[PDB]
A paper describes a structure:
The number of cellular processes found mediated by Piezo channels is large and growing at a rapid rate. Their essential biophysical characteristics include responsiveness in gating to mechanical force (i.e. mechanosensitivity) and selectivity of the pore for cations. Viewed down its 3-fold axis, the trimeric Piezo channel is a triskelion with extended arms; from the side, it is curved as shown.
The refined structural model contains 1518 residues (out of 2547), with the N-terminal 576 residues and internal flexible loops missing. At the center TM37-38 form a 3-fold symmetric channel lined by TM38, capped on the extracellular side by a CED, and extended on the intracellular side by a pore extension (PE) helix. The cuff consists of ‘elbow’ helices (residues 2116 to 2142), a ‘base’ helix (residues 2149 to 2175) and ‘hairpin' helices (residues 2501 to 2534) from all three subunits. The transmembrane pore, lined by TM38 and the PE helix, is closed. However, the detergent micelle containing a trimer is curved into a dome shape. A negatively charged patch of amino acids (E2257, E2258 and D2264) on the CED lies in close contact with a positively charged patch (R1761, R1762 and R1269) located in the extracellular loops of 4-TM units 2 and 3.
Author numbering:
A (entry chain C): 2164 to 2355
B (entry chain C): 2452 to 2456, 2463 to 2546
C (entry chain E): 1155 to 1365, 1493 to 1578, 1655 to 1807, 1952 to 1997, 2015 to 2065, 2075 to 2163
D (entry chain E): 2500 to 2546
E (entry chain E): 2212 to 2259
The structure:
């Protein structure tokens, strides 16, 4: 390597004096500078592998509703679906921003949502579903209301089918919402 | 909304920028140590010696290989003989 | 002297506050009266009591009519909802027609109705009108006093000393430029010597070629009192050396103001005879401040004045040193608040001043002119008035429901231009007005208010930029410190669609650092002009028109420090000896640890060595350049 | 190491004054000082 | 970074039961749920 460098110094001798280099400075020095800044610059890639497709909305498909009187059958399975599941207009955002004036947290935490995040689900109150019976379920609901003093629990459960094609893994989100029924209460007497 | 997929990985950014940092500092900061073996004038005699060793490796006269190799080792054990043996003339 | 000399401009501050914090037409009259008196105060204090008191009585009569017209419009407290929803050019929010008395329509409880609603938080506003009324009558007592008869007699002598104050500026500037002239000539004589030493050695080589409680009561006495008091006294010593350049000429003009008052006591002047015995009988003290005093041509009360202000005690002597620093270096203070309110208000109309700061206040080579400071004063007055307007809910962009729509959104064009209806709408513009007028008062105290149309201004502007022999300083170490602190703040800004903007900040920061070593090593003043012009314009566009965030404000503060230093190297030139590394000068202990700590940073020594090779003009290759600087780093 | 700082600072001011023949000849002094450690012993005594 | 939150119990919510006679409908869908889903006492461990 040294011998070849010395022979190119012989075959192409630069003038033995005050020879400033013309553009080979910009040829290889600027190459080194740009390459080395690029080594500082790959956090472009380190931040392009973070938070890319964030923004696809979880508009649900189905919403169901039950009402279980104790350990017996539900009174409803109202799977409210499309097109009765309706998204918002911007005037619906105006309605929420006007109906929730005297709370600051209401205004802030509704304004956190996009014009597509918040969807209605117009649930029909008229089920087309025969409430299934049996003379054990018949009589023991009557016994838990008339004779039974133990607290009957009424749940109110949900469902949400979400697009797995829109990303995300959790399809269904549910919560039970239990109210108990006291003995000699007005609710048990009216149901009896 | 959907996020379909920090603090423990920016430290691995600082890890890889330090590794490449001292990797480029390999090319710098220690070449004054190598001036006495690479910044030398006319190198004709040592190519004569190395090509002597190669053809002696062909002709299997290996005593000449060991004696020429003792010339190489002693040329690289004494930089003032490197100055003698690599003048320009 | 605090009351009878400095508590007159405080009155104009209270006039500006009563205009600002309660908004009406009469508050606009308070603002215009404040602006007129801030302009003409230096000649109002020099009038006589048959005319200044007439103008002052017009001001007192204005405040009384403000109070009485608010009673005349408290007539409309009863008839209120009749004039409300009927458009009488919406006359309620003109005069802020709202009541304060309890036995009425109960304001800020009928705020719940909102369609064409009023403003309750700006009340009847008689509080600040009565506070101003207190200050106006107190000043009338002051203008009718003999104490003001001493103060105005003291001010007229400064009105005479304007010419000699400019003469003392001329003396110190000629002495400083000749001092740099001696430094440059001695340095080039050293380079001539050393080049002859190198040539003489190598021509010899040509010829050779030719051939107990006290154990901790000691701590809670010494480390409590004495060591802390020594550090506080060291800070006073540092500020005294920081403003001795102003303190000495102020003391010289103080002694001559004493003698000029004793000449003004019965006559106007007599051939400047008070200047004859002043500098001659005390010339050693008048040698550091005055130089050309005797070329053109003892006081005991000031002696005991100094002797009884030398024993003020700490935290008042420190305050005196601090106020002398503020009064001396006030160009930078005006620049500081012009930057500071633009850091807070991110508007497009608050861009107008710091662009002109970085391009026309910093780039005028001796000093900023009359024209800039008058432009800054007039534009801040216009900005106060135009932000005082559009605090009215007249026009539908000022209404409250669309304000809830455009809350915290940098797309609304009054929010982009700076017309927000917030309560603190004057962020720092009050501080900016007092800073600009105080600096005008200092420059008025001294002698400082002296294809075809763009050419005789700008060609002469660059003719100022490229022909004066001014100074020789090197500020590149401080510029590069500010650039590293920019990088530190940006990497702290990734600790937060916003982080994709800090990336383009990093590319432009690396590009500016590269072009900085290019222009520094090639000494090109013209290129550094164009580079600072394109940076001021492009950064002030790209930050505020496109992108508030505290780390973005803090990056802007360090970057505008960097613009101040780059313009300070536009003036004061480049020295004719760049001299390599800045840490290889003193050979100290801490200097060694800073050098090794510099090399511990990954990619600085590489870039320093490569770019110094590219932009200097040597014969070596790249590897030879690396060999030299590795030898030099090991040997240092 | 006083003499070699004299030589390196000579190279730096010669890089300023553009008398680059002196740069090449002083750089030949550096290379030969780092090619011969017995001259390093000569040139870095204490005295 | 290994075996941190190991230990959270899989106590179920619902248990259903069917009985399909051939390719025809089930006779039961008894979704036995809470509170009829009851965990153990330590005496139940003693019983086992």
């Amino acid at each position: 390597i040294i011998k070849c460098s010395r022979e190119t110094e012989k075959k192409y001798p630069q003038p033995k004096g005050q020879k400033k280099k013309k553009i080979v400075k910009y040829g290889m020095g600027g190459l080194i500078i740009l390459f080395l800044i690029a080594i500082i610059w790959f956090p472009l890639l380190f931040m392009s592998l973070i938070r890319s497709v964030v923004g696809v909305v979880n508009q649900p498909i189905d919403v169901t509703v039950t009402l279980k009187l104790g350990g017996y059958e539900p009174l409803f399975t109202m799977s409210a679906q499309q097109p009765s599941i309706v998204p918002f207009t911007p005037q619906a955002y105006e309605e929420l921003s006007q109906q929730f004036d005297p709370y600051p947290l209401a205004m802030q935490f509704i304004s956190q949502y996009s014009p597509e995040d918040i969807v209605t689900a117009q649930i029909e109150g008229s089920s087309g579903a025969l409430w299934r019976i049996s003379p054990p379920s018949r009589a023991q609901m009557k016994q838990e209301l008339y004779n039974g003093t133990a607290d009957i629990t009424l749940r109110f459960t949900w469902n949400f089918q979400r697009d797995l094609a829109k990303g995300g893994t959790v399809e269904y989100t549910n919560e039970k919402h239990t109210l108990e029924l006291a003995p000699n209460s007005t609710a048990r007497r009216q149901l009896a | 909304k959907v996020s379909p997929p920090g603090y423990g990985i920016v430290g691995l950014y600082v890890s890889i920028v330090l590794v490449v940092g001292k990797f480029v500092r390999g090319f710098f900061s220690e070449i004054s140590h190598s001036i006495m073996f690479e910044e030398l004038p006319c190198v004709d005699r040592i190519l004569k010696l190395c090509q002597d060793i190669f053809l002696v490796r062909e002709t299997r006269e290996l005593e000449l290989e060991e004696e020429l190799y003792a010339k190489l080792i002693f040329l690289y054990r004494s930089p003032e003989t490197m100055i003698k043996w690599t003048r320009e003339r | 002297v605090a009351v009878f000399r400095y508590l007159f401009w405080l009155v104009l501050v209270v006039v500006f506050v009563a205009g600002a914090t309660r908004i009406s037409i009469f508050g606009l009259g308070y603002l215009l009266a404040c602006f007129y008196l801030l302009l003409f105060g230096t000649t109002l204090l020099q009038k006589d009591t048959r005319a200044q008191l007439v103008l002052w009585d017009c001001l007192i009569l204005y405040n009384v009519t403000v109070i009485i017209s608010k009673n005349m419009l408290s007539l409309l407290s009863c008839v209120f909802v009749e004039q409300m929803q009927s458009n009488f050019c919406w006359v309620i929010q003109l005069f802020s027609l709202v009541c304060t008395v309890k036995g009425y329509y109960d304001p800020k409880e009928m705020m719940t109705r909102d369609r064409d609603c009023l403003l309750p938080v700006e009340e009847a506003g008689i509080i600040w009108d009565s506070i101003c009324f207190f200050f106006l009558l107190l000043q009338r007592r002051i203008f009718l006093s003999h104490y003001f008869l001493h103060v105005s007699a003291d001010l007229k002598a400064t009105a005479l000393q304007a010419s000699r104050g400019f003469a003392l500026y001329n003396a110190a500037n000629l002495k400083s430029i000749n001092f740099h002239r001696q430094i440059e000539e001695k340095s080039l004589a050293q380079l001539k010597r050393q080049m002859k030493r190198i040539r003489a050695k190598q021509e010899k080589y040509r010829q050779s070629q030719a051939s107990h409680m006290m154990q901790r009561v000691l701590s809670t006495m010494q480390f409590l009192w004495v060591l802390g008091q020594a550090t506080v006294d060291g800070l006073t010593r540092w500020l005294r050396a920081f403003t001795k350049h102003h303190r000495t000429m102020s003391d010289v003009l103080c002694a001559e103001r004493y003698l000029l008052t004793q000449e003004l006591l019965r006559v106007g002047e007599v051939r400047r005879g008070v200047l004859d015995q002043l500098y001659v009988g005390e010339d050693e003290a008048t040698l550091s401040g005055p130089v050309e005093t005797r070329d053109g041509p003892h006081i005991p009360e000031l002696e005991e004045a100094e002797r009884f202000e030398a024993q003020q005690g700490r935290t008042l002597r420190l305050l005196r040193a601090g106020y002398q620093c503020v009064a001396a270096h006030s160009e930078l203070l005006c620049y500081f608040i012009i930057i500071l309110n633009h850091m807070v208000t991110a508007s497009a109309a608050s861009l107008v001043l710091p662009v002109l700061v970085f391009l026309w206040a910093m780039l005028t080579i001796p000093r900023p002119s009359k024209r800039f400071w008058m432009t800054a004063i007039v534009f801040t007055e216009v900005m106060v008035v135009t932000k005082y307007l559009f605090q009215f809910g007249f026009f539908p962009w000022n209404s409250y429901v669309v304000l809830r729509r455009y809350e915290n959104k940098p797309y609304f064009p009054p929010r982009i231009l700076g017309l927000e209806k917030t309560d603190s709408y004057i962020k720092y513009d009050l501080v900016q007005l007092m800073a600009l007028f105080f600096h005008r008062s200092q420059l008025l105290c001294y002698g400082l208010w002296d294809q075809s149309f763009y050419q005789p201004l700008q060609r002469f502007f660059h003719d100022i930029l490229h022909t004066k022999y001014r100074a020789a300083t090197d500020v590149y170490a401080l510029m590069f410190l500010a650039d590293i602190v920019d990088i530190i703040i940006i990497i702290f800004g990734f600790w937060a669609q916003v982080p994709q903007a800090f990336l383009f900040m990093l590319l432009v920061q690396f590009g500016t650092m590269v072009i900085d070593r290019a222009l520094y090593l090639r000494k090109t003043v013209l290129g550094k002009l164009a580079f600072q012009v394109v940076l001021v314009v492009a950064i002030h566009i790209w930050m505020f028109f496109i992108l508030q965030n505290a780390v973005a404000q803090l990056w802007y503060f360090v970057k505008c420090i960097y613009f101040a230093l780059s313009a300070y190297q536009i003036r004061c030139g480049y020295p004719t000896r760049i001299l390599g590394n800045f840490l290889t000068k003193k050979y100290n202990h801490l200097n060694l640890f800073l050098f090794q700590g510099f090399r511990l940073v990954p990619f600085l020594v590489e870039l320093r060595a490569v770019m110094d090779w590219v932009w200097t003009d040597t014969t070596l290759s790249l590897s030879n350049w690396m060999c030299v600087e590795d030898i030099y780093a090991n040997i240092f």
